[PDB]
Inverse folding.
């Protein structure tokens, strides 16, 4: 967003929880805002593998 | 003063006919044209377009004493009609319809 | 598409006056009938959707029109005549619509025709098959975007794709560039970069001051007040100075029109044709969304000035560049805005061949007959072809069309059917290695499912939308404009360009339509009208950015919405009185619609979602304390509605690793049931 | 440092030099209207670009519901004890983590850095 | 006294006029000027800090409108006329502009609804038909064909050719006016067969391309 | 100032050209193409 990561924070928040630090464990479950950032990381990690095969072959 | 005390009431009429079409002849206020300097004027539709749509050509104080070109506005009664309100000797008001808007500008 | 978008196409079509005498033809009204099948011996009968599947039929409905014909020979009489309900063609029908045979039936009758009461509908039956249309993404139109191509001669660039209210087959686009600084030369090193423009339908680049003078405004005190709105700014005026130096020798209107008129699709041999040619291209192809009439050319000057005033702000570093993948700059093409685009190119093609049949038939001077002029196989086989095969074009145009639309419905399991009728598609290539159109963007919160996407070569190119996401359908900006003018909004013509520095430019649907001097009271007056639905419908978005000092309003189709809960000072507006009467919809006639019309929920677009402050849960974020914020404006219903259809059947999905949730959502689509 | 417009044809007045009294004359290139220069300087180029954005931020930003607020720093010109602060949000972001404030009292609009 | 001559009298008299913007619905009421042309009453009250002007409708015309004064600054205007005798006259210069607005008599929403009442019909909607209308009729002779047949029976080309020399009177006749004529122009005069007409044309003349195809015959220069 | 030997194409535009030419083609120090040079001492045996 503009000066935000999600519409649930106030502008120019640089704290740890507001920019991706997931402080729970997979046994205690994640909160929604952490679920979303986790999805982002997973998505980029998923695209790189799709590229690598064709390139190396 | 009166402009600060002149309470009054006057009748308004809107005649269904007129002996002449009424138009607006706008002028640049920054130019501050002295109308007194206008001894005479000529007024003709512009010849570049070689009638009712024609832009006006105004020649004041001779052919080159003063000259302006008037360009018609896009609309005049597209949502609201414009009226000319004139004071009569009986104090009553007379309203005249604005047929068209022409924009007049100075010409080197 | 079938109540409004088809009536407007035939109604807004040029008559075919043709010729001695001459003739008239114009179309008035369109009708439709229920889908019908013509038996082998010519006896009609309504076809039910089941026989269409068994006998490999097609589910379509016939189309009529009223035509009136007047002969004009000034033969002391104007003879007119009309032929009403003339056959034209056949249109496919989407199942369960308002024009299907299954509209508004009860389960006792749906089972009697051998139909499933749980079938959702929303697909076509074409030659037995079941086709579904995929919503295509598209860059938003009628707005200014500022990018920076770091490879070519340009140091900055602007864009504006314009289309005049669903009436043009193409969409004219215009750039406003600015040349690079490090131009190796001992001449322009001192003056600097020159603002250039690349108009459509011309070969060569054009300086901006030239195209400004072609609209009048030859003086340089009048040009530099459309582009710079306050003359106490020396830093900007210095930047526009080297733009005048090259357009200094050409200093009058007619020679300017010749300059741009010299390089077109046809170089003019004479002079008057160039001055004619340059007149309309600068009048009907430049910014058609502002106004296409030959009058009102002061508006095309202001907007072209705002387009340039915004390009300089991006060079002084006062405003950030626009984002390409920001999901507030995208629109979606559903079945409506897709079949209407395909119906224009086949109605013009039907009128282009009534002439060819009339002229060949009127030179011999015999007479005219129209029931034999209409080639009915144009519209019938035109739609049915492109839907059945997918390429979004024509039959002899199997090479110039966009492919991948209109694929076959998936009927493997019931949750693979629903996940097919709700699917987007970004039209970029399927093998490009650029990651930025594939990665997950922050603006997809609550409107596109974050976990559900296929692997392989199409990662992140097709996407499914979330559960409560709602796409708008469109409306006419007429009733808001008539309210704005009566709420103290100065038009553009009747104002002085010096009363523009401390005013908030008011846009509506992309068009600059005035200014205002007290915006904060206008805004919370526009809003409390929408909350209770008097003049403004609930799907318009109204943005106000305090810093750039303007106000935008949208009414078009393609924007994506989702409902939220309205919050006053620090308490929800949903009192208990709304719940104990909402658990009784069965015999009370109180439902979702009576909830929107009472001002407790509200649809929030993506653009509007940047001027809002959300709370994720009431009982926990709206308690007075040493608190994060205190000016919450909205609240979510349940944060579990950010997932798609195939990803909301996973138990405890917030305990798994992320790539795992992507696999199952692409794997529960092929489970037997 | 500013700009000069002709008084007859409303165009851009260029600077010129006359070899008689050693004074800067501003001339036009459509007509030849003339006048002398009062500051006798033409070009200036600021490369430091250390413009303090206290001259560019607007007073109505205190109507934004998405900005943080404070009870610590009160306003000086009016004594109100509630402010709203933010960052530069512009270019020149090399060492740009200052914190400009704006008073939130109606019709005060006082701005100040720290 | 000339058409392009403009009277400057008004201007030179410094004649002043007033300019007022009026809504169309009111203006539509005004096209129905009560009786001859009576239409109401303007009321003007000026106080120390408030000058109030308003107009009230004629009781007849009816079967408070406050004024908003507008600036004529930036553009000082004048009024010029065209008589029904097409004479041209400048009546005056505009000394005031104003707008008639509603006040405490209507809410914005239903006022917008009143505009909606003014144009309240729905533009060409697509209606729903019942069953299917007849499309194919049973006509015997197409109407267009019958009109052509009647015209043909009027004239038959199969004419006779006696006293053939007379054409030449008509052909030469035409040939003196223009040196050459397209075969089609000659046919427009002689209704006899072209082959036989070409023999008559070839007998007394020769055909030149004249340079742009177009079979064209001319009298021999001898 | 310019060398006055030239005064016995306008000198103002020439002076602006020279001003806009010297601040980019200065060549104070270093080699033309290398732009940024860092500095550190390693800890590895590499
Ligand atoms: Zn000048
Ligand atoms: Zn204060």
């Amino acid at each position: 967003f503009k000066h935000r990561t999600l519409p649930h924070f106030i502008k120019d928040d640089y704290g740890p929880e507001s920019r991706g630090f997931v402080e729970n464990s997979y046994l205690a479950g994640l909160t929604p805002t952490e679920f979303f950032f986790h999805a982002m990381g997973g998505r980029e990690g998923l695209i790189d593998t799709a590229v690598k095969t064709a390139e190396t072959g | 003063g009166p402009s600060s005390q002149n309470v009054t009431e006057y009748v308004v009429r809107v005649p269904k006919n007129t002996t002449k079409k009424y138009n607006i002849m706008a002028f640049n206020a920054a130019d501050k044209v002295n109308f007194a300097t206008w001894n005479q004027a000529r007024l003709e539709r512009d010849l570049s377009n070689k009638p009712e749509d024609q832009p006006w050509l105004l020649r004041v104080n001779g052919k080159s004493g003063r000259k302006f070109k008037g360009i018609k506005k896009g609309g005049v009664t597209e949502n609201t009609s414009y009226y000319i309100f004139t004071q009569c000797p009986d104090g009553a008001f007379e309203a005249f319809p604005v047929h068209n808007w022409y924009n007049f500008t100075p010409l080197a | 598409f079938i109540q409004m978008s088809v009536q407007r196409i035939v109604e807004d079509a040029p008559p075919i006056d043709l010729q001695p005498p001459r003739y008239l033809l114009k179309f008035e009204q369109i009708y439709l009938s229920k889908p019908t099948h013509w038996e082998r011996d010519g006896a009609p009968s309504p076809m039910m959707p089941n026989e269409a599947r068994l006998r490999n039929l097609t589910y379509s409905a016939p189309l009529y029109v009223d035509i009136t014909k007047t002969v004009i020979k000034e033969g002391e009489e104007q003879l007119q005549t009309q032929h009403q309900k003339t056959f034209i063609g056949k249109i496919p029908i989407m199942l369960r619509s308002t024009y299907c045979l299954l509209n508004g039936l009860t389960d006792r009758d749906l089972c009697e025709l051998n139909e499933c009461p749980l079938d959702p509908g929303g697909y076509f039956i074409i030659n037995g098959s079941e086709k579904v249309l995929i919503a295509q993404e598209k860059m938003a139109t009628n707005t200014v975007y500022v990018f920076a191509k770091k490879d070519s001669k340009y140091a900055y660039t602007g864009e504006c794709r314009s289309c005049l209210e669903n009436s043009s087959r193409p969409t004219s686009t215009i750039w406003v560039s600015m040349l690079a600084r490090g131009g190796q030369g001992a001449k322009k090193s001192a003056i600097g970069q020159r603002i250039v423009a690349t108009l459509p339908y011309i070969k060569q680049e054009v300086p901006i001051i030239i195209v400004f003078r072609a609209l009048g405004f030859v003086s340089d005190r009048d040009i530099l007040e459309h582009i710079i709105y306050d003359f106490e700014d020396p830093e900007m005026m210095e930047m526009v100075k080297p733009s005048l130096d090259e357009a200094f020798v050409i200093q009058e209107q007619n020679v300017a029109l010749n300059f741009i008129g010299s390089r077109g699709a046809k170089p003019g041999v004479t002079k008057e044709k160039r001055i004619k040619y340059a007149k309309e291209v600068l009048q009907k192809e430049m910014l058609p969304h502002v106004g296409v009439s030959d009058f009102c050319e002061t508006k095309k000057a202001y907007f072209l000035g705002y387009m340039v005033h915004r390009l300089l702000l991006a060079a002084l570093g006062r405003r950030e560049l626009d984002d390409r993948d920001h999901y507030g700059n995208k629109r979606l093409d559903l079945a409506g805005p897709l079949l209407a685009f395909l119906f224009r190119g086949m109605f013009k093609n039907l009128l282009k061949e009534v002439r060819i049949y009339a002229q060949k038939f009127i030179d011999r001077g015999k007479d005219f007959n129209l029931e034999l002029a209409i080639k009915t196989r144009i519209i019938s086989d035109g739609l049915k072809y492109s839907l059945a095969t997918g390429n979004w074009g024509d039959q002899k145009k199997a090479h110039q069309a966009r492919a991948g639309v209109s694929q076959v419905l998936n009927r493997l399991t019931f949750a693979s059917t629903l996940s097919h009728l709700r699917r987007l598609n970004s039209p970029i290539g399927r093998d490009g290695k650029l990651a930025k159109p594939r990665q997950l963007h922050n603006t997809l919160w609550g409107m596109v499912c974050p976990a559900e996407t296929p692997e392989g070569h199409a990662v992140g190119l097709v996407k499914n939308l979330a559960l409560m996401a709602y796409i708008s359908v469109g409306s006419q900006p007429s009733p808001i404009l008539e309210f704005l003018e009566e709420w103290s909004m100065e038009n553009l013509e009747e104002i002085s360009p010096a009363a523009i520095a401390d005013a908030t430019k008011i846009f509506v649907n992309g068009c600059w339509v005035g200014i205002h001097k007290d915006p904060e009271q206008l805004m919370n007056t526009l809003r409390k009208l929408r909350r209770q639905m008097d003049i403004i419908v609930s799907e318009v978005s109204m943005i106000r950015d305090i810093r750039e000092r303007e106000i935008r309003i949208y009414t078009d189709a393609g924007r994506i919405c989702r409902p939220l809960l309205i919050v006053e000072k620090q308490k929800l507006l949903l009192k208990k009185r709304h719940i104990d009467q909402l658990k009784e919809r069965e015999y009370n006639n109180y439902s979702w619609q009576d909830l929107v019309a009472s001002g407790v929920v509200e649809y929030i677009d993506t653009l509007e979602e940047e001027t809002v402050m959300l709370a994720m849960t009431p009982d926990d974020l709206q308690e007075k304390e040493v608190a994060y914020c205190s000016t919450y404006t909205h609240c979510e219903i349940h944060p579990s509605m950010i997932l798609g259809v195939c990803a909301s059947i996973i138990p405890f999905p917030d305990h798994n690793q992320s790539p795992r949730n992507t696999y199952q959502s692409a794997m529960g689509k092929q489970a037997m049931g | 440092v500013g700009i000069r417009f002709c008084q007859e044809c409303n165009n851009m007045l260029y600077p010129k030099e006359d070899k008689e009294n050693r004074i800067l004359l501003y001339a036009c290139r459509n007509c030849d209207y003339q006048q002398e220069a009062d500051n006798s300087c033409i070009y200036v180029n600021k490369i430091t670009h250390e413009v303090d954005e206290l001259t560019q931020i607007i007073a109505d930003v205190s109507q934004d519901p998405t900005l943080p607020r404070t009870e610590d720093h009160p306003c000086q010109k009016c004594g109100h004890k509630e402010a709203v602060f933010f960052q530069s949000h512009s270019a020149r972001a090399e060492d740009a983590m200052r914190l400009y404030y704006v008073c939130t009292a109606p019709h005060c609009g006082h701005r100040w850095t720290e | 006294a000339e058409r392009g001559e403009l009277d400057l009298t008004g201007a030179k008299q410094n004649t002043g006029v007033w300019l007022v913007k009026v809504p169309k619905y009111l203006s539509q009421q005004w096209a129905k000027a009560s009786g001859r042309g009576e239409v109401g009453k303007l009321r003007i009250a000026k106080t120390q800090g408030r000058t109030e002007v308003s107009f009230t409708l004629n009781e007849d015309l009816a079967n408070e409108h406050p004024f908003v004064l507008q600036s004529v600054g930036g553009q000082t205007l004048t009024v010029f006329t065209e008589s029904s005798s097409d004479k041209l006259s400048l009546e005056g210069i505009v000394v005031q502009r104003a707008e008639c607005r509603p006040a405490a008599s209507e809410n914005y929403m239903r006022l917008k609804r009143l505009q909606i009442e003014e144009s309240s019909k729905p533009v060409r909607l697509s209606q729903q038909l019942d069953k299917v209308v007849t499309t194919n009729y049973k006509p015997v002779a197409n109407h267009q064909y019958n009109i052509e047949y009647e015209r043909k029976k009027k004239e038959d080309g199969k004419r006779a050719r006696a006293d053939k020399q007379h054409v030449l009177d008509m052909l030469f006749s035409a040939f003196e006016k223009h040196q050459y004529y397209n075969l089609k122009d000659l046919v427009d005069i002689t209704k006899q067969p072209v082959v036989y007409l070409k023999e008559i044309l070839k007998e007394i003349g020769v055909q030149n391309v004249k340079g742009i195809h177009k079979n064209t015959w001319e009298l021999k220069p001898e | 100032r310019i060398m006055n030997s030239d005064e016995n194409m306008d000198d103002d535009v020439f002076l602006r050209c020279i001003e806009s030419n010297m601040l980019t083609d200065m060549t104070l120090q270093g080699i033309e193409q290398i732009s940024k040079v860092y500095m550190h001492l390693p800890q590895t045996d590499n």
Notes: Chain F has one helix and no strands.
